[PDB]
mmCIF file of N, CA and C in Angstrom:
data_model
loop_
_atom_site.group_PDB
_atom_site.id
_atom_site.type_symbol
_atom_site.label_atom_id
_atom_site.label_comp_id
_atom_site.label_asym_id
_atom_site.label_seq_id
_atom_site.Cartn_x
_atom_site.Cartn_y
_atom_site.Cartn_z
ATOM 1 N N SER A 1 96.704 94.548 99.705
ATOM 2 C CA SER A 1 97.952 95.201 100.169
ATOM 3 C C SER A 1 98.849 95.592 98.996
ATOM 4 N N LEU A 2 99.894 96.381 99.293
ATOM 5 C CA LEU A 2 100.694 97.013 98.241
ATOM 6 C C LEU A 2 101.376 95.981 97.341
ATOM 7 N N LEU A 3 101.900 94.926 97.964
ATOM 8 C CA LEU A 3 102.640 93.859 97.263
ATOM 9 C C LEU A 3 101.700 92.980 96.482
ATOM 10 N N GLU A 4 100.491 92.800 97.010
ATOM 11 C CA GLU A 4 99.479 92.023 96.299
ATOM 12 C C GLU A 4 99.032 92.786 95.050
ATOM 13 N N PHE A 5 98.760 94.084 95.194
ATOM 14 C CA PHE A 5 98.358 94.941 94.091
ATOM 15 C C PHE A 5 99.484 94.892 93.026
ATOM 16 N N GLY A 6 100.719 94.943 93.499
ATOM 17 C CA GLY A 6 101.869 94.891 92.552
ATOM 18 C C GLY A 6 101.872 93.635 91.718
ATOM 19 N N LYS A 7 101.639 92.519 92.362
ATOM 20 C CA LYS A 7 101.634 91.228 91.707
ATOM 21 C C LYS A 7 100.458 91.110 90.777
ATOM 22 N N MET A 8 99.326 91.703 91.169
ATOM 23 C CA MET A 8 98.181 91.680 90.285
ATOM 24 C C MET A 8 98.469 92.472 89.027
ATOM 25 N N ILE A 9 99.211 93.574 89.168
ATOM 26 C CA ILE A 9 99.542 94.457 88.021
ATOM 27 C C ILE A 9 100.480 93.725 87.081
ATOM 28 N N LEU A 10 101.433 93.012 87.676
ATOM 29 C CA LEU A 10 102.404 92.205 86.814
ATOM 30 C C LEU A 10 101.648 91.099 86.098
ATOM 31 N N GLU A 11 100.786 90.379 86.798
ATOM 32 C CA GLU A 11 99.959 89.330 86.207
ATOM 33 C C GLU A 11 99.117 89.849 85.028
ATOM 34 N N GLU A 12 98.563 91.034 85.167
ATOM 35 C CA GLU A 12 97.671 91.591 84.107
ATOM 36 C C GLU A 12 98.504 92.049 82.898
ATOM 37 N N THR A 13 99.501 92.859 83.157
ATOM 38 C CA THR A 13 100.147 93.609 82.129
ATOM 39 C C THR A 13 101.469 93.058 81.653
ATOM 40 N N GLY A 14 102.111 92.283 82.485
ATOM 41 C CA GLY A 14 103.437 91.838 82.205
ATOM 42 C C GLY A 14 104.505 92.873 82.515
ATOM 43 N N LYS A 15 104.130 93.990 83.129
ATOM 44 C CA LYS A 15 105.059 95.035 83.528
ATOM 45 C C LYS A 15 105.175 95.014 85.045
ATOM 46 N N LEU A 16 106.361 95.217 85.579
ATOM 47 C CA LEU A 16 106.560 95.298 87.004
ATOM 48 C C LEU A 16 105.905 96.544 87.543
ATOM 49 N N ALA A 17 105.170 96.445 88.629
ATOM 50 C CA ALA A 17 104.540 97.624 89.183
ATOM 51 C C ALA A 17 105.490 98.745 89.541
ATOM 52 N N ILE A 18 106.570 98.391 90.249
ATOM 53 C CA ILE A 18 107.738 99.279 90.371
ATOM 54 C C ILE A 18 108.792 98.825 89.295
ATOM 55 N N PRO A 19 109.137 99.684 88.321
ATOM 56 C CA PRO A 19 108.900 101.075 88.261
ATOM 57 C C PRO A 19 107.984 101.523 87.162
ATOM 58 N N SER A 20 107.239 100.607 86.540
ATOM 59 C CA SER A 20 106.353 101.002 85.437
ATOM 60 C C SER A 20 105.153 101.841 85.860
ATOM 61 N N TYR A 21 104.628 101.597 87.041
ATOM 62 C CA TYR A 21 103.492 102.351 87.507
ATOM 63 C C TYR A 21 103.665 103.076 88.816
ATOM 64 N N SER A 22 104.863 103.127 89.355
ATOM 65 C CA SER A 22 105.073 103.762 90.658
ATOM 66 C C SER A 22 105.493 105.223 90.656
ATOM 67 N N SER A 23 105.929 105.721 89.510
ATOM 68 C CA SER A 23 106.114 107.145 89.304
ATOM 69 C C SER A 23 105.663 107.668 87.937
ATOM 70 N N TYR A 24 104.512 107.255 87.484
ATOM 71 C CA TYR A 24 104.057 107.577 86.153
ATOM 72 C C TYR A 24 103.061 108.697 86.209
ATOM 73 N N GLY A 25 103.260 109.694 85.385
ATOM 74 C CA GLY A 25 102.338 110.776 85.250
ATOM 75 C C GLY A 25 102.146 111.570 86.513
ATOM 76 N N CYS A 26 100.930 112.031 86.701
ATOM 77 C CA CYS A 26 100.588 112.844 87.835
ATOM 78 C C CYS A 26 100.026 112.033 88.998
ATOM 79 N N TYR A 27 99.503 110.838 88.709
ATOM 80 C CA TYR A 27 98.783 110.108 89.751
ATOM 81 C C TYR A 27 99.313 108.706 90.108
ATOM 82 N N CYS A 28 100.164 108.111 89.307
ATOM 83 C CA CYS A 28 100.558 106.775 89.624
ATOM 84 C C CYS A 28 101.708 106.849 90.580
ATOM 85 N N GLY A 29 101.507 106.393 91.794
ATOM 86 C CA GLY A 29 102.516 106.547 92.808
ATOM 87 C C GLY A 29 102.105 107.623 93.772
ATOM 88 N N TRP A 30 103.007 108.035 94.616
ATOM 89 C CA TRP A 30 102.679 108.869 95.746
ATOM 90 C C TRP A 30 101.996 110.202 95.447
ATOM 91 N N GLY A 31 102.355 110.845 94.364
ATOM 92 C CA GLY A 31 101.812 112.154 94.062
ATOM 93 C C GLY A 31 100.327 112.209 93.772
ATOM 94 N N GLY A 32 99.756 113.392 93.849
ATOM 95 C CA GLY A 32 98.466 113.607 93.241
ATOM 96 C C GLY A 32 98.006 115.021 92.941
ATOM 97 N N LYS A 33 98.083 115.500 91.705
ATOM 98 C CA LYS A 33 97.476 116.784 91.363
ATOM 99 C C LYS A 33 97.271 116.954 89.888
ATOM 100 N N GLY A 34 96.469 117.921 89.491
ATOM 101 C CA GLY A 34 96.338 118.251 88.108
ATOM 102 C C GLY A 34 95.571 117.311 87.207
ATOM 103 N N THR A 35 95.588 117.621 85.927
ATOM 104 C CA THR A 35 94.942 116.766 84.936
ATOM 105 C C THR A 35 95.773 115.519 84.573
ATOM 106 N N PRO A 36 95.169 114.334 84.578
ATOM 107 C CA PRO A 36 95.928 113.132 84.248
ATOM 108 C C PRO A 36 96.487 113.187 82.839
ATOM 109 N N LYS A 37 97.716 112.732 82.674
ATOM 110 C CA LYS A 37 98.448 112.885 81.445
ATOM 111 C C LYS A 37 97.907 112.083 80.298
ATOM 112 N N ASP A 38 97.424 110.912 80.627
ATOM 113 C CA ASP A 38 96.957 109.982 79.645
ATOM 114 C C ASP A 38 96.042 108.976 80.293
ATOM 115 N N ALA A 39 95.591 107.991 79.537
ATOM 116 C CA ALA A 39 94.646 107.010 80.052
ATOM 117 C C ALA A 39 95.172 106.199 81.208
ATOM 118 N N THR A 40 96.415 105.781 81.128
ATOM 119 C CA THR A 40 97.050 105.048 82.198
ATOM 120 C C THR A 40 97.095 105.930 83.447
ATOM 121 N N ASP A 41 97.441 107.183 83.277
ATOM 122 C CA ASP A 41 97.496 108.137 84.445
ATOM 123 C C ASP A 41 96.065 108.290 85.013
ATOM 124 N N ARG A 42 95.054 108.255 84.140
ATOM 125 C CA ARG A 42 93.661 108.329 84.589
ATOM 126 C C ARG A 42 93.276 107.055 85.367
ATOM 127 N N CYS A 43 93.838 105.872 84.998
ATOM 128 C CA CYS A 43 93.633 104.659 85.797
ATOM 129 C C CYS A 43 94.046 104.942 87.253
ATOM 130 N N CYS A 44 95.217 105.557 87.383
ATOM 131 C CA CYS A 44 95.741 105.830 88.725
ATOM 132 C C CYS A 44 94.873 106.815 89.475
ATOM 133 N N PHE A 45 94.433 107.879 88.785
ATOM 134 C CA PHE A 45 93.563 108.849 89.407
ATOM 135 C C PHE A 45 92.282 108.197 89.928
ATOM 136 N N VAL A 46 91.654 107.366 89.085
ATOM 137 C CA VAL A 46 90.426 106.723 89.527
ATOM 138 C C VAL A 46 90.739 105.792 90.685
ATOM 139 N N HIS A 47 91.863 105.133 90.627
ATOM 140 C CA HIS A 47 92.266 104.214 91.710
ATOM 141 C C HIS A 47 92.486 104.971 93.011
ATOM 142 N N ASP A 48 93.062 106.157 92.915
ATOM 143 C CA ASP A 48 93.251 107.032 94.095
ATOM 144 C C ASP A 48 91.865 107.397 94.632
ATOM 145 N N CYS A 49 90.960 107.728 93.730
ATOM 146 C CA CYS A 49 89.574 108.048 94.116
ATOM 147 C C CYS A 49 88.899 106.892 94.774
ATOM 148 N N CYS A 50 89.106 105.681 94.229
ATOM 149 C CA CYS A 50 88.581 104.481 94.769
ATOM 150 C C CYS A 50 88.986 104.215 96.214
ATOM 151 N N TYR A 51 90.262 104.358 96.480
ATOM 152 C CA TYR A 51 90.773 104.232 97.840
ATOM 153 C C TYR A 51 90.184 105.382 98.720
ATOM 154 N N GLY A 52 89.960 106.561 98.160
ATOM 155 C CA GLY A 52 89.413 107.728 98.882
ATOM 156 C C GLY A 52 87.991 107.513 99.228
ATOM 157 N N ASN A 53 87.319 106.616 98.554
ATOM 158 C CA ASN A 53 85.979 106.202 98.935
ATOM 159 C C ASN A 53 85.975 105.359 100.230
ATOM 160 N N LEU A 54 87.145 104.911 100.686
ATOM 161 C CA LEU A 54 87.320 104.009 101.831
ATOM 162 C C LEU A 54 88.273 104.581 102.902
ATOM 163 N N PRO A 55 87.719 105.696 103.526
ATOM 164 C CA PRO A 55 88.610 106.316 104.511
ATOM 165 C C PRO A 55 89.015 105.443 105.723
ATOM 166 N N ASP A 56 88.161 104.559 106.045
ATOM 167 C CA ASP A 56 88.562 103.790 107.201
ATOM 168 C C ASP A 56 89.102 102.402 106.833
ATOM 169 N N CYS A 57 89.527 102.217 105.581
ATOM 170 C CA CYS A 57 90.255 101.026 105.170
ATOM 171 C C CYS A 57 91.748 101.309 104.955
ATOM 172 N N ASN A 58 92.600 100.351 104.896
ATOM 173 C CA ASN A 58 94.012 100.550 104.817
ATOM 174 C C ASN A 58 94.587 99.682 103.705
ATOM 175 N N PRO A 59 94.476 100.166 102.489
ATOM 176 C CA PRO A 59 94.801 99.335 101.311
ATOM 177 C C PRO A 59 96.271 98.971 101.154
ATOM 178 N N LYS A 60 97.181 99.699 101.743
ATOM 179 C CA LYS A 60 98.582 99.337 101.658
ATOM 180 C C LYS A 60 98.939 98.056 102.393
ATOM 181 N N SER A 61 98.319 97.849 103.538
ATOM 182 C CA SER A 61 98.662 96.787 104.411
ATOM 183 C C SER A 61 97.662 95.656 104.435
ATOM 184 N N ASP A 62 96.375 95.934 104.106
ATOM 185 C CA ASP A 62 95.366 95.026 104.353
ATOM 186 C C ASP A 62 95.325 94.039 103.154
ATOM 187 N N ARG A 63 95.534 92.773 103.445
ATOM 188 C CA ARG A 63 95.555 91.704 102.425
ATOM 189 C C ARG A 63 94.184 91.142 102.162
ATOM 190 N N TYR A 64 93.861 91.041 100.871
ATOM 191 C CA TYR A 64 92.630 90.402 100.404
ATOM 192 C C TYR A 64 92.938 89.141 99.654
ATOM 193 N N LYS A 65 91.905 88.366 99.319
ATOM 194 C CA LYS A 65 92.153 87.207 98.499
ATOM 195 C C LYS A 65 91.378 87.322 97.204
ATOM 196 N N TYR A 66 92.034 86.915 96.112
ATOM 197 C CA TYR A 66 91.315 86.790 94.861
ATOM 198 C C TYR A 66 91.731 85.578 94.059
ATOM 199 N N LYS A 67 90.943 85.226 93.072
ATOM 200 C CA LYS A 67 91.200 84.068 92.238
ATOM 201 C C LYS A 67 91.042 84.454 90.804
ATOM 202 N N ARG A 68 91.423 83.558 89.899
ATOM 203 C CA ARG A 68 91.221 83.770 88.487
ATOM 204 C C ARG A 68 90.196 82.770 88.022
ATOM 205 N N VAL A 69 89.155 83.221 87.333
ATOM 206 C CA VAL A 69 88.192 82.324 86.692
ATOM 207 C C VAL A 69 88.187 82.634 85.203
ATOM 208 N N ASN A 70 88.659 81.723 84.371
ATOM 209 C CA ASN A 70 88.731 82.015 82.958
ATOM 210 C C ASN A 70 89.679 83.184 82.731
ATOM 211 N N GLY A 71 90.624 83.384 83.611
ATOM 212 C CA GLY A 71 91.550 84.486 83.488
ATOM 213 C C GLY A 71 91.050 85.767 84.128
ATOM 214 N N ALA A 72 89.769 85.828 84.439
ATOM 215 C CA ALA A 72 89.184 86.988 85.077
ATOM 216 C C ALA A 72 89.486 87.066 86.549
ATOM 217 N N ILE A 73 89.746 88.253 87.057
ATOM 218 C CA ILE A 73 90.008 88.404 88.478
ATOM 219 C C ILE A 73 88.675 88.333 89.191
ATOM 220 N N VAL A 74 88.568 87.457 90.170
ATOM 221 C CA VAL A 74 87.383 87.391 91.058
ATOM 222 C C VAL A 74 87.822 87.636 92.491
ATOM 223 N N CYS A 75 87.381 88.729 93.086
ATOM 224 C CA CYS A 75 87.653 88.969 94.485
ATOM 225 C C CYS A 75 86.857 88.036 95.405
ATOM 226 N N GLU A 76 87.522 87.425 96.365
ATOM 227 C CA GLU A 76 86.901 86.474 97.270
ATOM 228 C C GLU A 76 86.518 87.138 98.565
ATOM 229 N N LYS A 77 85.571 86.569 99.260
ATOM 230 C CA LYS A 77 84.988 87.201 100.387
ATOM 231 C C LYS A 77 85.969 87.305 101.524
ATOM 232 N N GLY A 78 86.175 88.517 101.989
ATOM 233 C CA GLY A 78 86.885 88.847 103.202
ATOM 234 C C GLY A 78 86.087 89.828 104.044
ATOM 235 N N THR A 79 86.764 90.737 104.716
ATOM 236 C CA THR A 79 86.110 91.813 105.415
ATOM 237 C C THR A 79 85.585 92.797 104.377
ATOM 238 N N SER A 80 84.653 93.658 104.767
ATOM 239 C CA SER A 80 84.130 94.695 103.825
ATOM 240 C C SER A 80 85.271 95.510 103.208
ATOM 241 N N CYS A 81 86.272 95.985 104.021
ATOM 242 C CA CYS A 81 87.379 96.698 103.504
ATOM 243 C C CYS A 81 88.148 95.892 102.504
ATOM 244 N N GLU A 82 88.389 94.628 102.792
ATOM 245 C CA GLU A 82 89.231 93.824 101.916
ATOM 246 C C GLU A 82 88.495 93.615 100.598
ATOM 247 N N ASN A 83 87.199 93.407 100.676
ATOM 248 C CA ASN A 83 86.386 93.254 99.431
ATOM 249 C C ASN A 83 86.441 94.512 98.571
ATOM 250 N N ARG A 84 86.312 95.677 99.202
ATOM 251 C CA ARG A 84 86.250 96.970 98.505
ATOM 252 C C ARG A 84 87.647 97.319 97.952
ATOM 253 N N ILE A 85 88.687 97.143 98.776
ATOM 254 C CA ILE A 85 90.086 97.310 98.313
ATOM 255 C C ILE A 85 90.380 96.454 97.097
ATOM 256 N N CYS A 86 89.992 95.173 97.203
ATOM 257 C CA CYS A 86 90.239 94.248 96.012
ATOM 258 C C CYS A 86 89.562 94.805 94.739
ATOM 259 N N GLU A 87 88.342 95.250 94.866
ATOM 260 C CA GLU A 87 87.612 95.750 93.671
ATOM 261 C C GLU A 87 88.299 96.992 93.117
ATOM 262 N N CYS A 88 88.885 97.836 93.976
ATOM 263 C CA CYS A 88 89.591 99.030 93.466
ATOM 264 C C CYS A 88 90.875 98.558 92.717
ATOM 265 N N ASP A 89 91.550 97.578 93.292
ATOM 266 C CA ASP A 89 92.843 97.173 92.730
ATOM 267 C C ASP A 89 92.585 96.372 91.417
ATOM 268 N N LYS A 90 91.600 95.498 91.416
ATOM 269 C CA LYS A 90 91.132 94.783 90.220
ATOM 270 C C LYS A 90 90.857 95.771 89.082
ATOM 271 N N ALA A 91 90.086 96.790 89.350
ATOM 272 C CA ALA A 91 89.746 97.830 88.368
ATOM 273 C C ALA A 91 91.020 98.476 87.800
ATOM 274 N N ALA A 92 91.955 98.831 88.680
ATOM 275 C CA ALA A 92 93.155 99.500 88.223
ATOM 276 C C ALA A 92 94.011 98.597 87.312
ATOM 277 N N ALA A 93 94.118 97.312 87.695
ATOM 278 C CA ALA A 93 94.992 96.371 86.957
ATOM 279 C C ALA A 93 94.361 96.190 85.580
ATOM 280 N N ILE A 94 93.047 96.077 85.556
ATOM 281 C CA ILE A 94 92.316 95.863 84.276
ATOM 282 C C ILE A 94 92.453 97.163 83.431
ATOM 283 N N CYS A 95 92.395 98.312 84.076
ATOM 284 C CA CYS A 95 92.519 99.618 83.432
ATOM 285 C C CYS A 95 93.909 99.760 82.773
ATOM 286 N N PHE A 96 94.953 99.431 83.522
ATOM 287 C CA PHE A 96 96.348 99.432 83.009
ATOM 288 C C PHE A 96 96.407 98.530 81.778
ATOM 289 N N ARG A 97 95.917 97.308 81.903
ATOM 290 C CA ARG A 97 95.878 96.315 80.744
ATOM 291 C C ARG A 97 95.204 96.915 79.523
ATOM 292 N N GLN A 98 94.051 97.530 79.698
ATOM 293 C CA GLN A 98 93.307 98.043 78.563
ATOM 294 C C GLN A 98 94.062 99.162 77.850
ATOM 295 N N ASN A 99 94.954 99.852 78.557
ATOM 296 C CA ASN A 99 95.605 101.054 78.070
ATOM 297 C C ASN A 99 97.115 100.913 77.823
ATOM 298 N N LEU A 100 97.587 99.651 77.781
ATOM 299 C CA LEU A 100 99.003 99.353 77.478
ATOM 300 C C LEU A 100 99.442 99.899 76.144
ATOM 301 N N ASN A 101 98.505 99.940 75.183
ATOM 302 C CA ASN A 101 98.736 100.474 73.837
ATOM 303 C C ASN A 101 99.165 101.963 73.811
ATOM 304 N N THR A 102 98.781 102.736 74.820
ATOM 305 C CA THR A 102 99.144 104.147 74.880
ATOM 306 C C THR A 102 100.052 104.485 76.037
ATOM 307 N N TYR A 103 100.466 103.485 76.792
ATOM 308 C CA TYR A 103 101.499 103.698 77.856
ATOM 309 C C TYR A 103 102.741 104.315 77.211
ATOM 310 N N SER A 104 103.347 105.300 77.871
ATOM 311 C CA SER A 104 104.470 106.051 77.294
ATOM 312 C C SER A 104 105.570 106.277 78.307
ATOM 313 N N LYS A 105 106.801 105.958 77.900
ATOM 314 C CA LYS A 105 107.925 105.953 78.850
ATOM 315 C C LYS A 105 108.232 107.376 79.236
ATOM 316 N N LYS A 106 107.812 108.323 78.422
ATOM 317 C CA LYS A 106 108.056 109.741 78.725
ATOM 318 C C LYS A 106 107.358 110.285 79.985
ATOM 319 N N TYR A 107 106.283 109.601 80.415
ATOM 320 C CA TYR A 107 105.587 109.989 81.594
ATOM 321 C C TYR A 107 106.145 109.276 82.870
ATOM 322 N N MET A 108 107.168 108.456 82.723
ATOM 323 C CA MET A 108 107.855 107.847 83.876
ATOM 324 C C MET A 108 108.658 108.977 84.509
ATOM 325 N N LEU A 109 108.608 109.030 85.821
ATOM 326 C CA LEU A 109 109.304 110.070 86.607
ATOM 327 C C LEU A 109 108.841 111.439 86.190
ATOM 328 N N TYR A 110 107.583 111.562 85.837
ATOM 329 C CA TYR A 110 107.038 112.844 85.487
ATOM 330 C C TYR A 110 107.111 113.829 86.660
ATOM 331 N N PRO A 111 107.577 115.109 86.336
ATOM 332 C CA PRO A 111 107.681 116.019 87.484
ATOM 333 C C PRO A 111 106.373 116.604 88.007
ATOM 334 N N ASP A 112 106.308 116.827 89.294
ATOM 335 C CA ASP A 112 105.117 117.277 89.954
ATOM 336 C C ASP A 112 104.613 118.640 89.462
ATOM 337 N N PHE A 113 105.507 119.555 89.164
ATOM 338 C CA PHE A 113 105.109 120.902 88.819
ATOM 339 C C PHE A 113 104.373 121.002 87.489
ATOM 340 N N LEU A 114 104.496 120.003 86.640
ATOM 341 C CA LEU A 114 103.816 120.004 85.344
ATOM 342 C C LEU A 114 102.384 119.490 85.384
ATOM 343 N N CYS A 115 101.976 119.128 86.553
ATOM 344 C CA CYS A 115 100.634 118.615 86.793
ATOM 345 C C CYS A 115 99.647 119.767 86.980
ATOM 346 N N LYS A 116 99.317 120.373 85.838
ATOM 347 C CA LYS A 116 98.491 121.537 85.818
ATOM 348 C C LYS A 116 97.048 121.114 85.614
ATOM 349 N N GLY A 117 96.160 122.010 86.028
ATOM 350 C CA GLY A 117 94.721 121.826 85.875
ATOM 351 C C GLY A 117 94.122 121.322 87.180
ATOM 352 N N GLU A 118 92.869 120.927 87.110
ATOM 353 C CA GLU A 118 92.236 120.257 88.217
ATOM 354 C C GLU A 118 91.234 119.191 87.785
ATOM 355 N N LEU A 119 91.087 118.180 88.639
ATOM 356 C CA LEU A 119 90.076 117.173 88.517
ATOM 357 C C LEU A 119 89.497 116.806 89.858
ATOM 358 N N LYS A 120 88.181 116.740 89.968
ATOM 359 C CA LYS A 120 87.524 116.171 91.142
ATOM 360 C C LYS A 120 87.039 114.730 90.873
ATOM 361 N N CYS A 121 86.956 113.927 91.925
ATOM 362 C CA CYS A 121 86.672 112.503 91.811
ATOM 363 C C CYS A 121 85.312 112.187 91.230
#
């Protein structure tokens, strides 16, 4: 679910999901178009794609369970949707962590019209 994903993002990166990742670039947060601005924006794009692989799941509301083993995120067995949602959110949190070095405050509140180009999943 949305709040769980948020907490996972804070746990990984030390940044609050809102507002560090809720309006960043072209893909982090509600929007979606154009070429991703940077690696962090590409995390969001892939995460959007990941959720798009699960049309009949509801990642905003549906709660999954996970644990940490050696600091690693391990998704625990739930419903198929919850398992798949967890793996998408795990990937995104790890993606954000890997790309903290190039995160840029200039892409916060990035405007929609500058999202030029195209990308398919």
